[PDB]
């Protein structure tokens, strides 16, 4: 049944045959003979799943363990939305367990929050925090700001010249010309106040803008390119060294995100009755405040933390992000959180808690939210896709849910640390 290389090549070149007639072992025979490269297996094979099966068989003979791919699943998966959009060189998928904590009573609504994780007790802990919040009358949240950023670096011949460009961008007329260029690229491109910083002849420009319900990194990048092109017309000696000069700052810890915000800035709060702190959280209000000051404030201060004044916001942010099709790498900046706790009520025995997260980078359209399983989790929360009547409302709601769930996670872990229940 296996044919030689030359007979198999004329069949593939045929416009009304292709690889359909050729067998599995026959296409792999063309790869080793080097007549067709490795990267020419996408647009030549008809179905996506068969292309995944061929990539896996070529891969298995390179690995030190032959049956390593055995328990990595690939069949019955919709690769149509993944190929040429979300992933390349695809050899299957990685199933991550999804649990549910809730109901989370947030802004007079009830949410069943999906959480994708492999850390034991995390879902159960977050659920216990939701239970305390619910018996305490619920939580309230506000989105304080909204605006994804990109922070290019440009170079002038001299620092005197870069100072000229900074001054020009600070005039109402200069900013207006740059804003028109930025806003011409997309419907949600709406440039907010510029933030500029000089380092000699370098100039770092932080462009900021809302992006509807998208996280908006591609949107902001397009607007930034157009704006810098317009800036070059007025200043032809300027060199665009990089569209990202790490001033954004994206996927790295940076004080600029902590202080200025990036994406959605959010605050959440709740009051937990003394009775609920006892019976649900197994501790006291006095014990909670004590651990919060000396762990989340003083402890993080001693550790030299910028933006890490919390117990484990990163656990909840990451779990929600993976379940809801977000960029999980943006957990770096999105986990920025300060958790504060005071005594409250008439007898000063109730627990006031608040979480403030100035840089939640989030979206309900684009990226991993285009995949159906991810959209199922977004649909649980009622935030799937773009909100037609109120652009950005679904992304803002998801950010509020993240902050609220983070607060629930902070309550439960801090109670366990305070009481010494570490089993």
């Amino acid at each position: 049944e296996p044919r030689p290389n030359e007979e198999c090549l004329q069949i593939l070149g045929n416009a009304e045959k292709g690889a359909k007639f050729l067998s599995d072992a026959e296409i792999i025979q063309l790869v080793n003979a080097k007549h067709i490269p490795a990267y020419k297996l996408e647009t030549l094979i008809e179905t996506h799943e068969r292309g995944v099966s061929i990539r896996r068989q070529l891969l298995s003979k390179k690995l030190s363990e032959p049956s390593s791919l055995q328990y990595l699943p690939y069949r019955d998966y919709n690769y149509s939305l993944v190929m040429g959009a979300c992933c390349e060189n695809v050899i299957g998928y990685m199933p991550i367990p999804v649990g549910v904590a809730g109901p989370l009573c947030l802004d007079e609504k009830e949410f069943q929050v999906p959480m994708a994780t492999t850390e034991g007790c995390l879902v159960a802990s977050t659920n216990r925090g939701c239970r305390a919040i619910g018996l305490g009358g619920g939580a309230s949240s506000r989105v304080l700001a909204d605006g994804m950023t990109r922070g290019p670096v440009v170079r002038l011949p001299r620092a005197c010249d870069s100072a000229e460009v900074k001054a020009w961008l600070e005039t109402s007329e200069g900013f207006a010309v740059i804003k028109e260029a930025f806003d011409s690229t997309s419907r949600f491109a709406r440039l907010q106040k510029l933030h500029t910083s000089i380092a000699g002849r370098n100039l770092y420009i932080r462009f900021q803008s809302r992006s509807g319900d998208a996280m908006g990194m591609n949107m902001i990048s397009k607007g930034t390119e157009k704006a810098l092109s317009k800036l070059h017309e007025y200043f032809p000696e300027m060199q665009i060294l990089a569209v990202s000069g790490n001033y954004c700052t994206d996927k790295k810890p940076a004080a600029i995100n902590w202080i200025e915000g990036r994406g959605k800035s959010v605050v959440c709060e709740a009051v937990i009755p003394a009775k609920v702190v006892r019976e649900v959280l197994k501790t006291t209000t006095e014990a909670m405040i004590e651990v919060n000051i000396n762990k989340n404030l003083v402890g993080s201060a001693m550790a030299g933390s910028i933006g890490g004044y919390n117990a484990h916001a990163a656990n909840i942010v990451t779990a929600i992000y993976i379940a809801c099709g977000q960029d999980a790498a943006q957990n770096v900046g999105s986990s920025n959180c300060i958790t504060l706790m005071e005594a409250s009520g008439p007898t000063n025995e109730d627990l006031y808690i608040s979480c403030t997260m100035p840089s939640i980078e989030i979206g309900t359209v684009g990226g991993g939210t285009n995949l159906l399983p991810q959209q199922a989790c977004l649909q649980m929360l009622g935030v799937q896709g773009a909100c037609k009547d109120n652009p950005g409302e679904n992304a803002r709601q998801l950010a509020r849910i993240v902050c609220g769930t983070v607060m629930a996670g902070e309550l439960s872990l801090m109670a366990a640390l305070a009481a010494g229940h570490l089993v």
Copy 2:
């Protein structure tokens, strides 16, 4: 069959010969709704794990504004045996993350096919392009510089003079020997390194550090810390243990202490990319790459007020490999710490020297998510699955080196695209 009356369903349930297996899904749901079977007691009462997940989904679906929300969230034919009571609770299914492959990665005279779980377009292809440049330049070399997971509890004494006494006692050879004895008694892999202590008035933050074989070590180090603090309490009975973690570890938050002291595996990688390879693979020059690395990764991060963020996108690669290999993806916060350096090299000064230094890669090949079969498949691709019997910690060390090397590949490709303005996807 049709739903039988509630009295009949409760007789079959409490039979022992039949149980919940002889009831329908509809029959179990009507008992929970009428308050007979509590609701939370469905876990151990249902026979199989998959059917328990199915019932939880049906119950949950009636509480949603859109009851068909979970239709495309998969759940059937997945091995929940390893997940329940270990990795996840209140399980309603699983989330498929596409897995791409970036390789071969030539590192320490070996070749690696690196699994990467992501939904970010062009990331796997860009990483693969970086691997190509490294492979045509004679390969990369890496070293593990340090190894030791940490836990940083906060204890309190009545006064700062008392906490000072405890700090000094821990710094004596005799005091440290007693604490190391207690700590190391909790596990055969436990070997307590020198303690780092910091006072804040009457507070005392103690950073315990130790190897943990091939495990990431969080549980192991915490158990050691609990026993060590109990022993310290015998010598200082007035000491209060305020919290087993006082954020001095520091785990899953940005912190300068992880950058300066290290946490988990500290690793460095490097490679020389010939001038020809920089042109034909990366589509740029060595001069352009060095200019961007200085003014983006060093000066740019400096202007942004970054601690540990002196890189382009280490977090992208770290997160991808972590999700694929059953790691704690939340630990991307500190594990992504990286400084990328670039210099001219060779006789003509036209070749591109690059290094990536990552002082706090928190990683393991046993425990947690690495107990699941799918993420064991990805670990098996790299030859690092499970515990190494002949050399405890070698598998985890090897994985840390692959992360640093893959980050360096990703750094080369993205930095080349930024330098030359190849930003279209």
Copy 3:
């Protein structure tokens, strides 16, 4: 050694007073409880004698009563110090002042006074000035200007603090607060507010120019009036502290590095390859190598925010003490990133630049009211208020600081590059 009753008759005359008593009789009057330690400020006629008596009373409480022998105090103008600059004054502390120059900056020449006790600092800074002068001089620009104060207020809930933040961000709310702030002083002109929430806390960073003054007292007066006006719209608001460390004053803070505070400045020069070898005893290639791996990578490894330089703090502190500045503000004022590149047709010339986002400085008020300090300000042509262009003297002093820092950087970095650490 007349008795107490006789000495009190002299003190109560009006035509006699403490001038007709000896030091021993005044101290005899104090130690015996007849004239408590407080009235002596009024009763002793000259400030210098009040200082002498304070020293003699203090000397009896010391383990070594002869401790103050070499601390000088006579023939100093205490009239501008008492009730304004220092309390419980027992004398003055001479700090050596040297001169580094000429510093060729913006087509002018400056002789820069530097108060220090660190050997080789003035000579090194002087060597840096020579390198810049032979290279055609340095150029600088003030990029921003505005002192800040960062109070913390509190509301009953985070929802309420969020409402206050949104109100301040409307043009209508900001206008009302700006009008209240600007009413307090002729130079009070409020710039955009920066705000940050932490639960029910709201941190508000007020920023304004302040003419030639460093502007701490002026910004605080405007801030108090502004928060009073803000309370009229939000009566549940509690002003917890006029400074909630969000300014941030005299502490290390990323907010100063990123947003600036006081004067933000940049300076630059190009040093010919010839000048680098002959004056600085090194090469351009050696200098760039050291700058990258010390000031950038080294500072990064140390976990530094704003400390991307060699010793900006040496020069800042030296000039500040000499020119009557607040030396404690060296914490934030020394923030600096030093960059070095190859330059010219063969890449053998050395481009240097220093960027300092938070130079907190003034030429009126504080220690700049004292005559010796005004002497150093007068050397640089920046003493006092500039009538014709308010703020020009303080802005010029900021430019001189940044230029002198760049000179100091050049010289020390050259020494480190060549191994000339003698």
Copy 4:
């Protein structure tokens, strides 16, 4: 005024206008005028006259004093190109009750109310039973950067320094340079082919910069014998870190790490500090902890430690540029006592860079202020105890200053005039 012909012939016979005409005529170069003039005060006078004709206002120098000051200890040690001295007012805050003793603390400042405020905080501590302090660590550092051909080579050097035999060789070389040189455990950090090595040692009563730099140079020379491919790029690679803000100083310490504490009775908080214990804690949490956190501070968890550090440093002949890191401080406040109305305060300062010998502490006025505190010069019987005592005084005075300012901020007592 005679012509320039006869002036060639030593320098004491020629007048002031004669020597100045030699400078503007280029008879003798400027660098050959230092050793020729014998008397120091006259050498300063001539430099001032030369300088005057370069200034747009020659009269600017008139109120900058210079006469009657002993330049013998300044020249060739503390300052170059000397044109006079800058008088800074010194005031006294005390008695500061610290560790069963009482100190009269000198403070050189031009900030109105600083001494008076610190004095109030001292009064509160005194009536509250006094303060207690401890030196937790002691060791000045120098943090050179060296480079090897590759990162695998730098890794090899890091591993070698971590072995007991390798460290013992480097410690022997370091300790041979001085009697006070005792090298502690090395902290190292790689960045590719770079290797940053933090040398740390006690330095007797000296701040230690020159002693540590000499021991560091001998250590790196010895390291070069085992690794001849190693380039010493810079003796300071900013890893020390000296005179810049650095998290490594905050976490590992530098110089003296110190803690101080006190309990202020509720009555004393009301009557001396004019506030309440509850108001103080509320402000400390929300300003010094949360506020500093929102500002992105590393080590700046305090109100104005820098005011007190700077004032003491200038009065006592310290390097005032080292205020940058020496001011690092976290101020904590808690409810205390059985009433819970007493105020527990603590200040922790991990990186006080300080000394009682060398530098400005050689000058006699500076030594007078050190003599007030009983810490002037080297402690003969126990090296380092004078410098340790000064550090304890600084931490204690900072705490006094924290108490008074924080009370003023809490109560809203912000009027300077009264």
